[model samples]
Each structure stands twice: as C-alpha cells, then as structure tokens.
Target: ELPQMVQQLNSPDQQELQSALRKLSQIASGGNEQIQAVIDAGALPALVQLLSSPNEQILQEALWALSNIASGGNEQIQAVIDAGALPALVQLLSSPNEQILQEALWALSNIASGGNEQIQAVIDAGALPALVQLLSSPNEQILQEALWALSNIASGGNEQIQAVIDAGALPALVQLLSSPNEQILQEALWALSNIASGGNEQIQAVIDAGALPALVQLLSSPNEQILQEALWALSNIASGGNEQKQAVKEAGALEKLEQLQSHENEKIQKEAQEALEKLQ
Candidate 1:
C-alpha cells in the first residue's frame, strides 16, 4: 500500500495522484514511524513536486504530508529540504487558494521549527515578505500560522529576528498584542519576546513599535499564560539598558510590575519580581 501510493504520485490523472497523496498523508499523520515509512517509500521528491501543483487538491495533500514529516524531527526535515521543498512551498505562500496558503504556511512553519539551517533555508527561499504580510491576514487561522512561523524563526536568535523585523513584522506583531483573542496575544508575545531578546536595536524595534503600553496592559491579563509572556517580553526590554528600562517604565509597566509581584501564580510573581529588578 505504501509503494502503491508512491507509484500513484506519478500517475497521469489528477484523481489518482490526489488520492495517493492523501493516503500517504494519512499514514504520515500516524505521527511517528509511519511518517518515516512514508518517506522511505520514496515519496519525498514526488511530494515536493506536488507542492506547486496547479491543482489545489494535490498541493494541499502534499503540503499536509510534508508538514507531518517535517514535524517528525531534524533528519526527516533535512530529507524534505534536500528534496528542494522550501522554494516550492515558499511559492505557495502567495497562492490565491486560501486553503493552499494556509497549508503552505503550516508546512513552512513546521520546517522553520527545525534547526538553524532549516530556518535559514526557508528565509533564503524568500518566505519573509509573504510571512510578514500574513501577520495581518483577515483569516485568524492564517495569522496564527504565520505568527507560529515567525515565532519559531525568531527562536533562532538575533540574525533571524532581524530578518523577521526587516520584513516589517513588528507593527503587526505589536498590534496583535492587544487582540481580544488571548491565543493571538500569547503567540504575538512569544514572537516579540524572541525579537526583544536580541540586542538594543532589536529590543528597540518592539519598543518603538508601541509594544510597551500594550504589553503593560497585557500584564493584567486574566490568563496567566498571557501575563507571564507579557512580563517575559517586558523583562527582555528592561534588560536592554536604563533608557530602555525607563522607556518601559514610562509606559506604565513599572506599576503593573509591582502589582504582579504578589500575583497568585508563583511563576508570574517570580517573573514580575525579576522584571522589577531589571528596571531597578
């Protein structure tokens, strides 16, 4: 059955190819050995071939399978990238097909979560503009997926964070910090915190993008997850220098920091105390 699906990848008819891709994707979703099994079945290059399929169905299925394989770990991700998957998937970031765009973002995001090389590969493949563009997507699903990509990409540290910031993601990321959707706020904070962890220039990017006031406001979030991430972001900013610390303080976070010092969540209080120490 595995080889059968692999064989169908080259079939002339779209239906045959589509079903096989989906079947392999199903196997891929087993989320472990089966993912490798699908890869070993010789499905990788062909799956990447389908990434640019004019047919949305084929493209979506291929992206689905590749996403899972990429998630399997570094070796599997290297296999996919070695198959030249990055450019093909990057091209689909502009797909007129909403589902196609979402799937491609999901796939690229998974790859971005890989090693530094994997993250840089996606960046070099020209994923930034579309990714930064999607930060403001009307589709929250796409927004979150794109944000996930940036968050993981930024996790690679300064150069990666600078790349993301260079693509104009800061304003959008800062805006999302005020989102009524806590999930969006959580992810936006994670991405920004990574960005903020960079040097003064990087820290100043989020700060100048108006992150401080919104971040201070988020410190009062009923969700401890948001509260913690907000403080984490602020702590990084406060660590920048006295001017940066005073800037955070000027935005009203100093008062909130003191308030959170006694927060019920021990982690939140500890972080709040630490943030205050940074400010001091």
Candidate 2:
C-alpha cells in the first residue's frame, strides 16, 4: 500500500520526512494508475499542508510532487490551482535557499502553462517580480527557471507583459546582456523576444529599458540561437518605426547584421537578412 505517504508525514523525525518525500518523488513518475492514486486520495491537501513544513526536505518534495502532477494533465493542474497551491510556490520564489526557489518557480510555470487563470494566479501571488529578481542571480539554473516562468506568464498577452514591466523586470532583464554564460544569454534573448512579441508598448518598454544595444550585441554571438533571437528582437523593435530603428542603428547593428549574413547557420543568415531589410 502507498500508506507510506501518510506514515512518513505523520512522523516527527527529520529522517522520516526526507524518506516520505523521496517516496512522493518516486510516485510522481509512476504509471497512470499510480499517479491517479495520489490525485484521487486527496494527496494535494496533504501536499499543501507540507508546504508549511519547516523542514527543507519536506518542502522540496512538496514542490517536486506538485511539479510532476502539474505536468500530468489539465485535471491534476486544475486541482493544484483550485487548492490555492500557487502562493506557497510563490513564497519559495524568494527563499534564500536557491534550489527550493528554483523548483518552486518551475512548478508554478508548469501549472500556469495550462492557461489564463493559472497565469493570473501566479501574478496575483507576486511571482513575476521575484522571477525578475532571479535574473540578476549568478546561478545559471535559477536564471533558467526564472526565464521559463517569465515566458509562461508572458503567454497571457499584454497584461502579463505589463505586470512584469510594472514590476521593474525590464531593467534587470536588459542587464543580462552582459552575462558571461552563453546559455543564459540565449535564454534572456529569447525572453526578450517573447516580451517584444506583446506589441508596441512591450517593444517600446524593452527599448526604453535599454535592451537594444545588448540585443544588437547579441547579433555577434557565435551561438546561432542567440543570433537568431537577436534578429527576432530587432525585427520586433523595427516594427516601432524611426525611433527604434535609430536606436538599433546606433548600436552598430548594421555591422553586426552584415557580419551575420555570412554566418555558418543559414537560419541566422536569413533572419539577419530580414532584420537588415527592415532596418533599411
């Protein structure tokens, strides 16, 4: 029987809590019947209770369990959403403990991937600003998870973008252009691409937040993905007209573009070609 789930949580010992959490993690990857057992048994209620546990092991497993189930389907996702599990996850976003905060954001991102209401819950719980704060952290994994959350939140359209912008996210995101990590650069460029996709205000917000030069600088990245995303951002910013175009041109984007036209990656060449024509 899966009675171990209850047994461990019931014990006051730290070792028992850790063992119980490991069981939950195993159950998280179980077959449909196993997964359903956890869901149908009101595991979510106990899971939510575990959210308040002072023990780090209990909290980590709690976060991982929610993440696995949220990845299960709409029902499991809706269950977590209805149980008001998001705020607990949001609190983890600001924890001094990096792993917990990263997993917390990852779980929230999965739940919010379901659609609008889930996205709004993340915002209501104040996760967006915390996600933004993570962008400045030196931890690569933290930055990656934070970008993933921002991308999901931004999928709700302009309001999500507005929420992040209003939360003072743009400045920190723009600053990532100087990150020494290439993967971080790639993801940050992608997040900026998504933000700019929200339309003129977002495009303008990114520009006003000082994203253009960094975006232009990204064009020179040997990483083809970064170059392609940089081109995509330029194309979006170009949609705003002479002001953005002027900002882009002054960033020495023209030289960067011409340089990319000879890139080994055909996609980069094609996007750069489009960006140059748009700039002209």
Candidate 3:
C-alpha cells in the first residue's frame, strides 16, 4: 500500500499526486512503523519537493505528513531535517491559510522539540524571528502554536532561550499574559517559567519585563497546572537572591504561597512552602 501511494506521489496528474499525498499523510499518522515505511519508500525527498507545489492543498498535505514524521523518533525526524524541511516550513509560516499555518507551526514545533542538534537546525534556519512575528497574529490558534514552539525552544537551554529573547519575543510573550484565553495564559506562563529557570540574567530579564505581578496573579488560577507553573517560576526567582526573593514577597506572593501551602496537590504544597521559606 505504501509503495502504491509512493508511486502515485510520482504521478504527473496533480489530482493523483494530491490523493497519494493525502493517503500517505493518513498512513504516516498511524504510528512510527508506518511513518518509517513511508520514509523507506523515499517519502522524505518527495515531500520536501512538494513543499514548493503551487497547489495549496498538496502543499498542506505534504506538510501534514512531514509533521507526523517529525514527531516520531530521532531517526525519522533526522530524515526530514536531512532532507531540508526547515526552510519550506518557515516560509509557510506566513501563509494566509489558517490550516496551512496551523500544520506548519505543528511541524516546526516538533522540530524545535527534538534533540539539541535538531533544535539548533531550526534556530539556524532563522525560525526564531519568523516564529516571533507570528506571536502578533490575531489568530488565536497561530499564537498558541507559536507560543508552544517557543516554549520548547526556550526549554532547550540558555543559548536557545537567549535566541528567543534576542528576537524581541519577551514583550509579545508578556503581552499574552493579558489574553482572556486560559490556554494562551497558561502557555505564556509556561514559556516564562522556562525563561526564568535559565539563570540570573534571563530570570532578571523576565522580572524586568514586568512579569512579577502577572505571575503572582496567576497563583490564583483555577487550573492546577497553571498555578503550579506560576509557582515554579516564582520559586526559580526566589532562588536567585535576597533581592529577588524580596521582590516576589513584596509583590504579595507570600500571601498566595501561604494559601497554596494547604493545596491538595503535594507538589504544589511543597513548592509553595519552599518558596515561602526562601522568602523568609
């Protein structure tokens, strides 16, 4: 069946190629073995070539398949990267088609979430600025996916976090703290948490960007994970120094942390208590 699909992928008829790509995309989503088979059938090079298709549907289908492949183990992901998938994926980030943008961002997110080498590949391909620009999009899904990708990139390490920071991402990320969407707010907090964990200068960068009050306010979020992530960021800040601890305490974080000390979640209670002790 895979070879059949791959054969049709090489067909001269546009409709046939599109149909083949759709079938391949479906099979690719089935599991890792299916994805590996498609790759064995030489799907990577063909998918990469189709990225330039003038047909939007074909281009979108190709991206969807590649995204599933990228989400697999490193070998499959490396196959996509080695075939040069980043440039086309980055270019598709600006597409006016929402579905295309969504699938493109999903693929980029997985690529950024890969090993250090893969993450660096995405960063080196100039994904940072293009991704940062998407943070300004009014499309809620696009903003969330961009934030997710950036969050993974930030988690990579100091160098990757700095790349995100240097691209003017902090301001837009901080601005999302005001978004009424709970998912948006949660992701913003998650990204800021990783940034705060990077070290003194990065933590201070988040603090200086006026994130303290927003993070403190997040302690009261109804969602347990959101509250935990907020506590995690504050705890990282508290670990910095007396000055940083005092800033969090002065932001009325102590009162919130004390309240969370009795939280049913043992992890939250422990982190809250630890942050409280640090502030003391």
Candidate 4:
C-alpha cells in the first residue's frame, strides 16, 4: 500500500500527488512500521521535493509526511535529514499557511529531539531565530509547537541549550508562564525544567528571568506531569548551590514540596521527598 502511494507520488498529476501524499501522511502516522515502509519505498526525496510545490494541498501533505517520517527512529529520522528536508522545513517556518508552519515546526521538533548530531543539524540550519520569532505568534498552535521544538532543543546539551538562550528565547519562554492555556503553561515549564537541568549559568538565567514564582505556583497544578516537571525544575534549582537553593526555599517552594511528598504518584513522591531533603 505504501509502495502504491509512493508510486502515485511520482505522478505529474497534482491531483494524484495530493491524494498519494495525503494517504502517505495518514499511513505514516500509523507508527514505526508504516514510516519504515515509506522510507523503504524511497519516498523521502519525493516528499522533500514536494515541500517546494506551488500547490498548497501538495505542500501541506508533503510536510505532514515529512513530519511523521522525522518522528520515527533515529535511522528513519536521519533519512529525512539526509534527504535534505531541513532547509525546506526551516524555510516553511515563515509560511502564510498556519497548517504548513505548524507541520514544519513539528518536524523540526522531532529532528531536534533526535540526538546531539540531529539537534546540531537543525541549529545549524538557522532554525533558532525563526523559532524564537514564532514564540510571539498570535496563534496559540504555532506558539505551542514552537515551544515544543525549543524545549527539545534545550534538552539536547549545553551547546544546544545555550543556542536557544542566545536566541533570546528566555524572555519569550518566561512570558508564556502566564498563558491561560494549560498546554502552553506545561510546555513553558518543561522548557524551563530542561534549561535548569543544563548548568549553573543556564539555571541562573532561568532564575534571573523571574521563573521562581511561576514555577512555585505550578507545584499545585492538578496535572500530574506539570506538577512533576515543576518539582523537577525546583529540584534541579536546589541542586545548583547555596544561592539557588536558598532562592527556591525563599520562594516558598518548601511547603509545596512537603505536600507533594505524599503525592499519589510514587515518582512524584520520590522527587518531592528528594527535593525536600536537599532543601532542608
């Protein structure tokens, strides 16, 4: 079926290309096996090429397929990167079409999450500035996906984390802390969590951005994952040193940590207990 789709992808007919790519995108979304089939069918080059199509339908479906392909295992993801999808994806970041922009961001996020080499590839492709710009988009979907991409990049390593911060991502990220959207709040916190995990300078940057109160407030989040990430951020901060540790304590995080020690999730309880012990 994938091979048939790939066969159709090569057709000169726009209608055929759109239909095939749409089907390919749907199949690729099925999971690893389907993605592998798409790659094995040698559909990557065609998909990347289609990224430049004048037809929005073809272009959108192409981006959708590439995003799913990049989300696969490292080899599959590498195939996407190797097929020269990065620049095309990055170029589309500024597309007037929200769907294309969102898909491109998702693909870049997957690539950034791949590994050090892959993360470096995306950063080298000049994605940082564009990503930072999207943080201020009026569109919540764009903002959320951009944050997701940056979060993955921050999680990469010191160089990658520093790259994001150097792009002026701190202020943008900190601003999202007040977002009424729970997803944005969670992702912003997640990005901060990774930044804190980076190192002293990075953690200090987050602290300097006045994330202490925002992070502390999330300790009471009903969302288990958000609460855990908030605790992890505080835990990493406390692990920094005397100044950072005292900063968290002074922010009134201790009381919340104590409450979470009895949290229903064992891991949350353990992290809270550990952070509490360190702060004590």
Candidate 5:
C-alpha cells in the first residue's frame, strides 16, 4: 500500500503530493524490501531535493526517505553518501526537536553502516560527539536508537572502532551497560559487542570498565533479545582469545551457554551451540 501511495505521489494534484509525502513518512518501517524498492524507483533524488524546501514537514519526509533508503544496503548507503547527505544529517543532530534528532541519527547510522570508509565519513562529519550526547538523553527511546547507531558504526571495522574510542564513547557506553533502563542496558551491551569486535584492547577496556559482569547478569534477563545479545557478546569475547575465554568463564557463561544450546529457538540454539563449541 505504501509503495502504491508513493507512486501516486507522482500525480499532478497538489493535495495528492502532500498526502503521498505524508504516507511516505510511515513507509520507512515497511521493511528492507519495501525501502529497496523505493530506492530502485528513483525516490531518493527527490527526497534529497526536498531537503532544500523551507517547510520542516517536507524536510522531515525527505530525510525519512533518505534514511529508509540508506538502510537497505551498502549501495543505497553509498548513494546517499555520494549525494552529500552526511553534512545535513549531522547538522540536524543538534536540533532541539527530539524527532529531528532521532531521524537524523537514524540516517547517519544507515549511511555509516556500509563499512569502514563510510564510517570514517561519519567521524569526519563529526557525528560521534552528537551521538554520545544522545546517549545521555532524558528520552530512553532516543538513547536506545543512538546506541544502536553507534553499535552499527562500531562494527564497520577496527579503524572505525578506534574512532569511537578516540571520541570518548566507551565511558558513556560503560555507564549504559549498567543502566537501570533495560532497553538502554541491552543496546549498550550490543554496542559493546561491536566495540569488542576490534580486538583484545577493546575487550580489556570493557572488562576494565566492569562491563563483563553487567553482561553476565543480562544472560539472566527474561527478554530473549537481551539474552541473545548477551550470549552473542559473550561468544565474541570467548572467540577473541584464551584470555577472553577465561574472562567469559569467570563470568559464569560457559555453563549457561551449554544449557541454552538446546533452546527451542533456532537462533538461541545455534548461538549457544556455537558458544560452547567455539569458546570452549
């Protein structure tokens, strides 16, 4: 239905254009395939053009479209990056409006999600500081999304991971790891997973900052996503080296991983099986 409405936005009626743009706003959550289809249909160029519109509403939908398109894949991300979208997105991060900030962060996350080079673009654009600020936001929803973006960018590669570290993000993330807000805690742990992907130094930093115990406690979380992410992070740590495996063992994760291997969910089963097999 959204794809159909997007096509109708091309109609000559002014009311139809406004209505279609409104619907385009919601189509972002439709899914990866729907977003990819929109990008393939040449929607991004118009979206980019709308950034110049004086109206905030038009700009909102345009950025939303850019963000949705950017999430599809590396090609879509590169397309937005190539169009010089990063600067505007970064500037919007400072917006007092929480919605603008969230949308801007989402767009930057999608753009930086491609790989190390694009991740560098995000750093060069100075997004890390704003992202860190968002982590401390009063709004937990924005904070969670900000952490999610940071996690994605941190996984782009080692250099990108270092960029976040250099920008002083680890400390904030460590705080989030121990946060009372379960959503924030989960996203923080997931971000640490990506940060740890860089290597031993990152692992040590997280452990030194006391993230390991917080992560272990999360394994006991009733929420499957939190538990799964906890398992995933532990597996990453376990796979990092003998020292990391020892650390994970100290955290009492080995027995838990072994037990979870027989979980009814295939992901849990596979992750748990891999944890014991690979980490052990």
Candidate 6:
C-alpha cells in the first residue's frame, strides 16, 4: 500500500491523486508505526505539494494526511515542518472557508504542541493575527479549534505566551470563560492559566478583561476536568500581586474553594487547598 500509494501520488490525473492522497491520509491515522510508513515512502514531499492544489478535494486530502501525521508524535511534527509546511499552514488559518480553517487549526494545534521550537515556528510564520481574530468569531467550531491552537501556543515559553497576549487575545479568551459549553470553557481556562502564570501583568490583563467572576462560577462545574482547569486558572490569578489575590476573594471564590477542600478528586482537593491558601 505504501509503495503503490507513493506511486499513485506521482500521477497527473486529479482523481488518481485524490485516491492516493486519501489512502495515505487514512493510513496516517493508524498510529505512529503507520505514520512512519507513510513518511518512509516519500509521500510527505508529495503531500506537502498537494496543499497548493486548487482542487478543494486535493487540498483537503493533503491536510488530512498532514494533519494526522502532525498529530502522531513530537518527532513527527518536526518532519512535517522540515518538509517546509509552516508558511502555507499558517496561510490557511485566515481562510474564509470554515472547513479549511478547521483542518488548518487542527494541524497547527498538533504541531504547536511539539514544544517551544514547533510553537515558535508557527509564531514566526505569522499565526498570531488570525488566531486572535478567530477567537472572537461567532462560529463555535472555528472558535474552538482556534482557542485550542492558541492554548497550545500559550503553553510555550514566556516570550511565546507574550506573543499571544500581544495579539490582544486576553479580552476574547477571558470572555469565552462564560461559554455554556464546557469544552470551550476548558480551553479558555487552560489559556488563562498559561497567560496568568507568566507574571502579574499578564494576570492583570486577564483580570481587566473580566475573568474573575466567570472563573468563580466555573468552580462549581460538575465535570472535574473543567473544575480542575478553573481551579488552576484561579490559582494563577492568586499567584499574582496582592490585589489579584484579593480579587479572588472579592469574586466569592473563597467560599467555593472552602467547599472544594472535601472533593473526591485528590488533585482538586490539593488545588482547592492551595488556592484557598493563596487567597486567604
């Protein structure tokens, strides 16, 4: 399949190319070993070139294979980037088309999660502008992936986190905390944790955008994952200056943190215990 899939990729017919690319992409999703097979067959360079095809199906199948490959492992992300995928990958973020945006953001999230080198590569490719802009989009699907990508990048070093903050994501990221959807709320909380831990000033920016009350309310989320993320975000805020520590108290998180002390999740109890300590 790898050898024939690689050969079919060399064909000029659009249908042949689409057929081959689709197979490679399906193979890409199998796991790390299958992913390596696609790579060893020299399909990566062909796949990278397919991203430029005007045929939407061709473009899509290319992204499918590349995105899955990018998601495989930390080292595989470097292979995708080494095939010179960054600039084009970043270019697709601003697409007016929602499907392409979804695929693009999905790809970026997997690659950016490969640690700071990959994250910085995305930043250097000029990703911040579209990511910050997409955060405010009315479309939930697009907004979710955009937040996921930005959250992945914010998980980078201080400077990379600052680069996200510099793009004016604080206001939108904080606002998303109030989303009824827990998944979106969790992404926003994760971003806030990273953003808040940078320093007092970053927390202040999040504070200025009104994260306090929303975060306090999230403390009651029945989903422990959301509860844990919200707890971490609040802890980071408390980790800030005295005003920030007191801000948590004024938001009424003190009472909630007090109750969380007895929760079943050990991590939740620990976070709640420390968050109370930070605020009290």
Clashing pairs in 5: none
Give the least accurate 10-residue stretch of model 4, judged by summed lDDT.
195-204
TM-score of each: 0.89, 0.83, 0.89, 0.85, 0.74, 0.85
Worst 10 residues of 2 by lDDT: 1-10
Off by over 4 Å in 1: 1-4
For 1-280, candidate 6 gives per-residue lDDT tens digits of 6888888987988778888888898989898998988888888888888777777888888988898999787878888988988788888887887888788888888889887888888888898898988878888888778878888888888788788888888888777877888878877888778887777777777777788888888889998998999888888888888987877788889889999999988889999888877776
Q: Report the C-alpha lDDT of model 2 over 129-203, residue by residue, as the tens digit.
A: 778778888778888888888878777777877787888877877888788878887888777777777766777
**Candidate 1 whole-model C-alpha lDDT, 0 to 1:** 0.85
Residue 273 lDDT (model 1): 86
Candidate 4 whole-model C-alpha lDDT, 0 to 1: 0.85
Regions more than 4 Å wrong, model 5? 1-54, 71-73, 252-270
- Give all candidates' CA lDDT scores: 0.85, 0.78, 0.84, 0.85, 0.76, 0.84
Question: What TM-score quantifies how close candidate 2 is to the native fold?
Answer: 0.83
Model 3 steric clash pairs:
none
| Segments in model 3 whose C-alpha atoms lie over 4 Å from true places | 1-4, 239-243, 264-267, 277-280
lDDT of 3 by residue, 1-280 (tens): 7778888887999889988898889989988898888899988888998888888888888988999888798667788899999999988887888888888889989887777678778888899998889888887878889989988888877777777788888898789887878888888888888777776667777778888888888899988888898898898788776767677777888788889989888989898988888777
Q: What ranges in model 2 sit over 4 Å off?
A: 1-21, 31-37, 239-255, 276-280
